[PDB]
Design an enzyme around this catalytic site. Sequence first.
Site, PDB file in Angstrom:
ATOM      1  N   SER A  34      76.363  98.859 117.535  1.00 45.99           N
ATOM      2  CA  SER A  34      77.438  99.833 117.701  1.00 45.99           C
ATOM      3  C   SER A  34      77.274 101.076 116.822  1.00 45.99           C
ATOM      4  O   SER A  34      77.975 102.070 117.059  1.00 45.99           O
ATOM      5  CB  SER A  34      78.797  99.200 117.416  1.00 45.99           C
ATOM      6  OG  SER A  34      79.173  98.284 118.443  1.00 45.99           O
ATOM      7  N   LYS A  84      76.746 104.355 118.528  1.00 42.95           N
ATOM      8  CA  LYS A  84      77.794 105.236 119.045  1.00 42.95           C
ATOM      9  C   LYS A  84      77.742 106.629 118.419  1.00 42.95           C
ATOM     10  O   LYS A  84      78.239 107.584 119.023  1.00 42.95           O
ATOM     11  CB  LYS A  84      79.173 104.601 118.841  1.00 42.95           C
ATOM     12  CG  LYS A  84      79.392 103.409 119.767  1.00 42.95           C
ATOM     13  CD  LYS A  84      80.855 102.970 119.830  1.00 42.95           C
ATOM     14  CE  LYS A  84      81.019 101.803 120.823  1.00 42.95           C
ATOM     15  NZ  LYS A  84      80.702 100.493 120.175  1.00 42.95           N
ATOM     16  N   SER A 143      85.348 100.711 118.849  1.00 41.94           N
ATOM     17  CA  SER A 143      83.976 100.415 119.227  1.00 41.94           C
ATOM     18  C   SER A 143      83.907  99.903 120.668  1.00 41.94           C
ATOM     19  O   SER A 143      83.370  98.831 120.958  1.00 41.94           O
ATOM     20  CB  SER A 143      83.345  99.428 118.237  1.00 41.94           C
ATOM     21  OG  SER A 143      81.952  99.675 118.133  1.00 41.94           O
ATOM     22  N   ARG A 162      80.722  93.419 105.186  1.00 43.98           N
ATOM     23  CA  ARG A 162      80.061  94.713 105.353  1.00 43.98           C
ATOM     24  C   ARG A 162      80.721  95.778 104.480  1.00 43.98           C
ATOM     25  O   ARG A 162      80.066  96.396 103.633  1.00 43.98           O
ATOM     26  CB  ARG A 162      80.080  95.125 106.827  1.00 43.98           C
ATOM     27  CG  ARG A 162      79.345  94.153 107.750  1.00 43.98           C
ATOM     28  CD  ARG A 162      79.538  94.482 109.228  1.00 43.98           C
ATOM     29  NE  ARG A 162      80.932  94.402 109.653  1.00 43.98           N
ATOM     30  CZ  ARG A 162      81.359  94.728 110.868  1.00 43.98           C
ATOM     31  NH1 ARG A 162      80.497  95.160 111.782  1.00 43.98           N
ATOM     32  NH2 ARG A 162      82.647  94.625 111.174  1.00 43.98           N
TER      33      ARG A 162
HETATM   34  C1  KE1 Z   1      79.075  97.029 117.899  1.00 42.92           C
HETATM   35  O1  KE1 Z   1      77.946  96.641 117.109  1.00 42.92           O
HETATM   36  C2  KE1 Z   1      79.713  95.824 118.598  1.00 42.92           C
HETATM   37  C3  KE1 Z   1      81.226  95.905 118.402  1.00 42.92           C
HETATM   38  N1  KE1 Z   1      81.479  96.585 117.144  1.00 42.92           N
HETATM   39  C4  KE1 Z   1      81.852  95.709 116.209  1.00 42.92           C
HETATM   40  C5  KE1 Z   1      81.601  95.919 114.774  1.00 42.92           C
HETATM   41  O2  KE1 Z   1      81.027  96.984 114.448  1.00 42.92           O
HETATM   42  O3  KE1 Z   1      81.925  95.060 113.915  1.00 42.92           O
HETATM   43  C6  KE1 Z   1      82.393  94.635 116.784  1.00 42.92           C
HETATM   44  S1  KE1 Z   1      83.455  93.544 116.084  1.00 42.92           S
HETATM   45  C7  KE1 Z   1      85.004  93.691 116.936  1.00 42.92           C
HETATM   46  C8  KE1 Z   1      86.174  93.255 116.059  1.00 42.92           C
HETATM   47  N2  KE1 Z   1      86.859  94.475 115.568  1.00 42.92           N
HETATM   48  C9  KE1 Z   1      86.263  95.671 116.224  1.00 42.92           C
HETATM   49  C10 KE1 Z   1      85.647  96.723 115.313  1.00 42.92           C
HETATM   50  O4  KE1 Z   1      85.499  97.860 115.763  1.00 42.92           O
HETATM   51  N3  KE1 Z   1      85.271  96.482 114.043  1.00 42.92           N
HETATM   52  C11 KE1 Z   1      84.968  95.195 113.426  1.00 42.92           C
HETATM   53  C12 KE1 Z   1      85.109  97.601 113.116  1.00 42.92           C
HETATM   54  C13 KE1 Z   1      85.256  95.154 117.249  1.00 42.92           C
HETATM   55  C14 KE1 Z   1      81.939  94.549 118.212  1.00 42.92           C
HETATM   56  C15 KE1 Z   1      81.076  93.301 118.364  1.00 42.92           C
HETATM   57  C16 KE1 Z   1      79.310  95.848 120.071  1.00 42.92           C
HETATM   58  C17 KE1 Z   1      77.794  95.845 120.226  1.00 42.92           C
HETATM   59  O5  KE1 Z   1      79.827  94.708 120.772  1.00 42.92           O
HETATM   60 CL    CL Z   2      77.985 100.641 121.507  1.00 42.50          CL
END
Ligand code: KE1
Ligand code: CL
Lengths: 242, 245
Positions: A47, A50, A95, A227
């Site tokens: 992600s 993006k 995301s 993270r």
């Molecule tokens: C991006 O890598 C993936 C997308 N983004 C993301 C993350 O960066 O942790 C998630 S976890 C999900 C739970 N909360 C949301 C979020 O934006 N954050 C944790 C900051 C999304 C999710 C897997 C994409 C490839 O699927």
């Molecule tokens: Cl993405």
Amino acid sequence: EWQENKSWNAHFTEHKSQGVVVLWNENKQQGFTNNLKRANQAFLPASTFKIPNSLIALDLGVVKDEHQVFKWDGQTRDIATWNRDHNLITAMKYSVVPVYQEFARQIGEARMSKMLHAFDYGNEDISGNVDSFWLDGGIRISATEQISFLRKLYHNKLHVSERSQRIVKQAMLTEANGDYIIRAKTGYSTRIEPKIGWWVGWVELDDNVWFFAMNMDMPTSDGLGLRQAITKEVLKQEKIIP
Amino acid sequence: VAKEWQENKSWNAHFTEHKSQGVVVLWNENKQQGFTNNLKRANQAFLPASTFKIPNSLIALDLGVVKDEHQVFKWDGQTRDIATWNRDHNLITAMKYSVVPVYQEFARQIGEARMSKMLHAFDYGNEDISGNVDSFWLDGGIRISATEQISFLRKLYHNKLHVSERSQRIVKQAMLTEANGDYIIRAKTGYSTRIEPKIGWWVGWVELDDNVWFFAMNMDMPTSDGLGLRQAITKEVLKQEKIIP
Ligand SMILES: *C(=O)[C@@H]([C@@H]1NC(C(=O)O)=C(S[C@H]2CN[C@@H](C(=O)N(C)C)C2)[C@@H]1C)[C@@H](C)O
Ligand SMILES: [Cl-]
Ligand SMILES: *C(=O)[C@@H]([C@@H]1NC(C(=O)O)=C(S[C@H]2CN[C@@H](C(=O)N(C)C)C2)[C@@H]1C)[C@@H](C)O
Ligand SMILES: [Ca+2]
Ligand SMILES: [Ca+2]
Ligand SMILES: [Ca+2]
Ligand SMILES: [Cl-]
Ligand SMILES: [Cl-]
Ligand SMILES: [Cl-]
Ligand SMILES: [Cl-]
């Protein structure tokens, strides 16, 4: 100029984890990291892609501005915040992969490759599906290469309009208070091993900017909060934030 | 103001509980609906004091007086009461610490004629810049009400002011005050002390996922010990309306 500060490894040890944090002091043009080898190991961006994807979409006019509404495509997905209309601000914040997959199809294979070469982004390889190569394709980027890319974005030095760069930097806003501003993007790459989590961005201070890029092993989703927490531990130890 | 303003008099409780007197004005962008505790004071015009840094920055950027938000403006060497002013600054930190000497030089470089023309283009307050070119928003003729601040900020939010889109984007970046997982606040405080009545200002907006709420508040400020009430009373009202948690 890169100093291996292995004392930061403790911050990963304390949390049952393995990873790398990379920091860049813009004023002094000095870089710091706990692990020079992993700092230069390339992974799928997931992600964090993006950021370049938004820039290309804005510069090509696929996205007209940060208020344009992208309709939910009507497919119910597991993450509930994805099943709604979005603009660029909320698509970044949540995301929202389906919105960005549509951007990549409208950008198309030829212009995506050209711009990634123009960006010097990772290994510039988009082998795989046009709408998923940053999830399970050939593109790879290291923590130090994320830094190099983000530095160009911060300085409006990428080969896209200044406007597109300002809009994406607005969309990257994560936290702001009287002490610092963080612009950043998280990532979580699961489709191909090793499963890792990402946090990349920068900390704006009154008189300096600190760029950061971290990734860590992420066997399960329970560790995702590490993270930001591990990065801030390092940021605090180095007196960058209170 | 196409829709008639709504008066929520219960908000006065947040002024009287601090033995203070003032007005909060809110604008719900999606509903195009305004709210205030006091319609009369909402329309009363005051000196803008430091809130004038918003139009001043816009004009300086549009005319090239400020090249970008990284250009450094050197300290002129004079030591002043506010310690953060005694240092070099860029646009971001000059707004954050409300560094008047930097903005007085902006206004001098803009000049009377262009300053007047731009404020008439913005329809900013009473558009009157009588007084010293580098102090008229502190002790000259310019006056703006809380509702007029809302109108001006709404144009800025939508990039509808008569300056470049770029100038508007940069100033909105410089207005950033707070950001968390729930909301973003872009705002500017003010404290008018040269001419009675001394008053405090807070003007800006709250960006939510799906809406924007504009706000403008002013209150009597007989001493500096009340300055925190500018933000605190506004946030009490935002919370009562369930705008922020
Ligand atoms: C991006 O890598 C993936 C997308 N983004 C993301 C993350 O960066 O942790 C998630 S976890 C999900 C739970 N909360 C949301 C979020 O934006 N954050 C944790 C900051 C999304 C999710 C897997 C994409 C490839 O699927
Ligand atoms: Cl993405
Ligand atoms: C601008 O109105 C004046 C400038 N701005 C300002 C304020 O709006 O608060 C102050 S108060 C002084 C003590 N704390 C610092 C501050 O700016 N904040 C609490 C936000 C500065 C100062 C009087 C300018 C006309 O002097
Ligand atoms: Ca290259
Ligand atoms: Ca109160
Ligand atoms: Ca009334
Ligand atoms: Cl460069
Ligand atoms: Cl531009
Ligand atoms: Cl911003
Ligand atoms: Cl001022």
